[PDB]
Symmetry: D3
Subunit: 281 residues, 6 copies
Amino acid sequence: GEAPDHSYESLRVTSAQKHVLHVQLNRPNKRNAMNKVFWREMVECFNKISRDADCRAVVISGAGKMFTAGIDLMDMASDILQPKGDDVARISWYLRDIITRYQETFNVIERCPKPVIAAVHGGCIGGGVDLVTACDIRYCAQDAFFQVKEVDVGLAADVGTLQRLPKVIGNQSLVNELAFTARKMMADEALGSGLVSRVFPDKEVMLDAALALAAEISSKSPVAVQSTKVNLLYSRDHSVAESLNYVASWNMSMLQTQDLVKSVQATTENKELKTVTFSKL
Amino acid sequence: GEAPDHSYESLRVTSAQKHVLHVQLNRPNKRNAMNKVFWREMVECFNKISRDADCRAVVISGAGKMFTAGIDLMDMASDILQPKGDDVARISWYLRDIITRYQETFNVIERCPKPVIAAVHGGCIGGGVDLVTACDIRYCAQDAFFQVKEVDVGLAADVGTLQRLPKVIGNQSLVNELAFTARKMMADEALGSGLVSRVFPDKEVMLDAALALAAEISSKSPVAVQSTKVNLLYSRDHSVAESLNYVASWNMSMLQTQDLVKSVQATTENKELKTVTFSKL
Amino acid sequence: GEAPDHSYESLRVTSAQKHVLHVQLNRPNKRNAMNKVFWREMVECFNKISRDADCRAVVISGAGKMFTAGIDLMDMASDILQPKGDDVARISWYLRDIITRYQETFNVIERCPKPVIAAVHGGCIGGGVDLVTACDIRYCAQDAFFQVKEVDVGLAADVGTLQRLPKVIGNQSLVNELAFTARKMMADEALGSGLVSRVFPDKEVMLDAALALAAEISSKSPVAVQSTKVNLLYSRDHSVAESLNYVASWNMSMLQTQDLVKSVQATTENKELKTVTFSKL
Amino acid sequence: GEAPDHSYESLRVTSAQKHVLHVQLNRPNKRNAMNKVFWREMVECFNKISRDADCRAVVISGAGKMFTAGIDLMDMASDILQPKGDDVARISWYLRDIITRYQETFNVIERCPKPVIAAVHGGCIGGGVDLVTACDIRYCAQDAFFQVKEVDVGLAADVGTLQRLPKVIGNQSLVNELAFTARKMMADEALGSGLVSRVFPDKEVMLDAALALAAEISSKSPVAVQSTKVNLLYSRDHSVAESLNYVASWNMSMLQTQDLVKSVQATTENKELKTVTFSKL
Amino acid sequence: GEAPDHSYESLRVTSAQKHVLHVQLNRPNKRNAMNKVFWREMVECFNKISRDADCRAVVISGAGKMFTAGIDLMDMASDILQPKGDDVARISWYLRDIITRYQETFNVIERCPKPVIAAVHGGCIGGGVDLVTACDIRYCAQDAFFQVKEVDVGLAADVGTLQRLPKVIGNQSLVNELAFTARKMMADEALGSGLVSRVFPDKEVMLDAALALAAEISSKSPVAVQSTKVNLLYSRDHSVAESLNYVASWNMSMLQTQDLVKSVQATTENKELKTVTFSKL
Amino acid sequence: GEAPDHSYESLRVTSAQKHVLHVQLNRPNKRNAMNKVFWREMVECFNKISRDADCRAVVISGAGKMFTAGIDLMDMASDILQPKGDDVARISWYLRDIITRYQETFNVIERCPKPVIAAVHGGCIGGGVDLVTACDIRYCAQDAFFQVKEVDVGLAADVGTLQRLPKVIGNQSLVNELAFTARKMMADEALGSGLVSRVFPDKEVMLDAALALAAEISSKSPVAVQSTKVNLLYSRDHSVAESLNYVASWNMSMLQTQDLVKSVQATTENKELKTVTFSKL
């Protein structure tokens, strides 16, 4: 059961439960290696998701043994090792265009108003860290591990690892230790450092709980949920004083909604918020 | 024993020990619900505290079973559900004024140079999170729990939760999980995430230790303590390079104090810093 | 075995293993007290380290019983208690110059492209916190403890503690508790708060593992390692959107390196990255 | 004819024409010297103006020969030359409070959503520059001149001159020349540098044209006019990319207004915008 | 003679001289009114221009009597007056999407590395100001005038006028006067305020000189010209210290170009820079 | 008559009048070409000037026919055309170090608390623009002209032209026109654009008036003058709200000066400020 608007050869988007989309990497044979097709499809996929009014939560998982094997070196070797340009200056313009495009692949996850939940089972190596670091909520199984493979490949992480990983956990000493040595951080250590919110025995239990969390989010008011993410992202990049100003300007319109009337009515009564239906956003 | 300058019908400010003010929410019957009277009194109270030279530490606790029950829906329903304005644009201006005024209620806690210690016993629901997130140091009892009820009510947190909660803990995955689902985070989970500094068996033990901590702060130099908070708050909203510049400009005057002479003299000797008296600030 | 270019009376820089420099505080009799000589030598030392192409990692440890005893009050009393200037305005200019120079002592550690690893054994009091908070990776022994002694001395931390300590750990409640009360935070509590990455039984085991970590960093590509720190530091002071732009402009030149060809060649094969040699940076 | 809500002994607020308030400094004998009474009344006056729905434009002029004679040295000598505080640190806190309060006197002019028009006749010395630099539109007569007298008094401008004057004109070379030498800049030179928008033969012609400009502003949509100032002020303090984001969030509510329907209807027809009436804001 | 890749029904892009593109609004009958087709075509057109290696300069002019008549009210009335959404919150999301898309129309002009020259003849009303304010260099004829019609329509400028107009001229008093009153600013006044660089007797002379300026830009090194615009735009939105850091990171790659060798060789000799050919960028 | 502490082979610093230093480029034969010796001497010179208590104003002029001929291509060709490094990544690090050092040459002019006055006679080509754009006040003769030669050389201005020139004049259209075409802007056009403050018939009259302006600045309070520049520079890089906070923290110490007592005493009386002597700063 597809979207069915979402048809991709490297992703499988299946609508699960209600108002919940399950975006699943669909390259088990290559361990979900991020080839050239993957980068463009993610931008196309999460642009449709943002325009989708029915969708209220997004769950990102992986097929096969592991979540992802990182960047596909074979395809991306040609772009870096054989660039286009007569001299260095022309090559730098060519490379900066490629880097910017690949950064857009993970920006759309952050710019998507719907919450994104990452279900990581098995290894999450290299560029896969950027995939989960852009997600709002991160879950992992017992066998999962996170590795910043970029230094081993020979380049600094330029797709989002060095820009979001220090901003999603507080143990900055660990962040430097991981980035500089490219060592594997197991699930138990990940939970202690706050990279993930919960740890589950295996993929099946993790996936069920991740979808259950998405269903709970979809039950809430879509306006309140979407506005919460926008202000949470804005507050990260700005000071407290500016963020307080921005949320005042943002909420002066979002407060005039029928969701507020119904949610308060349900809250004052004993009815659960799952019963009350909200309009499409 | 009041201030006695602090006389309010929703707050009870009692001077405890020396140079320590115990601001206590005083609506046990309504579970310290934040009605219209509460918002204006907090601004009035913490403005006097800042002007108070004798006060050096502030402890915020609650009366009754729980710390607070969040925003009072009955009083605040009229402002949101029945706004003033001919059309949407006029309503937006009216709502933005209300939001800005309510944000000022918690800003004065942060702008107060004296350190603020939060003693949370029982539930801390909804807007009460903003009350403690603006405090410098957060304590809790074993039965305490923190809940961001705003999404359940039907609106994004626009009084300070989404602006300070991600900036007081590093586990950003938990922050998104709490905000989006509005679930209750118990005391044990709160300590692990760093929202609180200590957990105590009950309110009585927590309150005694909170006042003991405030007494220790009051023993230190008021200039050094007040300057520390100003630079700590400034460093949060600015880069390292700018903050280092600001503290150099800030300390070039605060270093010329008699406290430095006496504190060093006490430190060089065996006398405790509690013995040496400092001038009013 | 000195650098031998690094000859100082308060520091001992010994080249250990390969591409690893072991900068060691060398005043055991005074417990590594930071006198006037220490401040200027650190600036001189880490300026040479940055220009040193062979060096790829830096380890900061201490001699004697403890890592450091903080600022030397006897020498620094004259500067603060007996300043130069006819009136307050002239004194403020004189004091601001002193504060700015002492801040430069710890800035060069952060500005040094080579990673810096701190090995803390015994006490780390007062200004020593700024020494380790500027380091990328912090290790400690079982007996180590970190104390912000500045408030006890009678002044706010103006050399980097209040500016970097909140930005290296997420438990902001603890940061305020430490700064305001100047209490000692033992090694076990430090590990829980994320100030340190690992805790070792004693100095000997901690030092061996710290040098082992530095050797692992030196094995990686110097271009990738140095670029990683620059982007990690930049991402801390800037938003995600700006940092993504900066790394794109930074990596468009650093991608055109022979390290990328060799590291990928080793990664595609079974050869360890320690075998492949990289050019001096 | 007063407001009549605006009753002050140093200001005279007269309602002129319709939706236009004429705030007039009213100390001709002392040449509109800014005594202690003036500073507090301005904050009170422009807080009421912001809450005033009928007012749509504000014109600031002066009585007597000149617009203003700057700060009243006699009253303000006691605050600076005889401060309160045992030592320098206590005095610095006392002085910073005074400086911050006096800055609030001119901030409320900028924070007032209604446009403010400055009509300057005669001298505008010292702190009077901050009064006009906070205004949106500045007019002057032929005999008017602007002088930054702060350096002659012996202090740097700390009430807004050094913070807004470089941001209202582009000739930064002139700004440094004026600030450093405290020379008088006549009206003709002021027009060339862009400090004022127009120059008029005398006060009577300038005042009539200033009120005519305010009447034209009041004819426009109050929502559009008020929103324009908010975005213009925000765009000054922020980058283009952030400002474009903010105006999108601001206008998503202000676009849903009856003013847009009527203004477009008038624009499509031949009716002047002065005929169509708009609701109070 | 088209691009010929640029085929649009509202724009006419003709390749003039060498490495110069002449983008021309092509709706003379409707006075170049910006209908729905115009907004999407501009994004498509300037995306191709950026990817175009041969193009080195861009000239924007208009067909018919006037440069542009602003926004087409008839087409854009449906979007604003008849939005999509059950209540205000849904409408606000719908409107914010529309505003953001229309802002992207003018962002691509700024994000285009090639310099953009605006040739304005006849009126430039309303949204046309955003078109020229995003251009690097602005020219105008004797009969040209610039008007911010947004307030007359009934909304604040949300497409770029209020965000770039204060940042392209220094006379902030005039900017407020223009925005608040929506008056027409003739060419002579525009030159005095610095909105335009030159004024020409008519469109024919202005167009010839604008293309001559573009030819001179195309003669220079494309790497140096493109890099200059990137740093000029970055310096506008950032402080001096950050911009100096960014240009150092930007130029460390762009300095390694064959253009530097040839341009210096030509400069050392008497050969004009027009003779030396540079590689495509 | 030298400093005599300032002894350089590319600069001639002569003490003129009282508290005024006349820094003069001293390479007339090479038209004040900026060779490798020049860059390091400027950093050394303006570091001593900042530490110099007697100096209160600085005047920068040039010897020979013209102010300066820009960067010396012969010496700087080796650094750019023949860099050090095995591959591009090593070269980029080498080039970035060179660019950063050369930027420091002009930063010290801005960081010097004493005001700097530029006296430009004859041509001011290329890097000489950065020399004068870092100065507070710019004067020029009738024959002077300013040219941004960097694009003609083949590189973007990376020493300060693109970072400070847009921030010292408001005519941004002219800035893009100058940078992109590298044309010469004569003195009359420079005055109209606000790059210079005054235009004089020749060097002799310009130099006398520049020294007369410096003498007038030296007559004022050194604390007030130095503080004015610090806040003027800070206000440029920061918003109004932050700058108002910074000046409040800066002036809370600088207000407690004997200069304020004497300057007010002179101002209240008829004595000129030139008579009253102020202490060294």
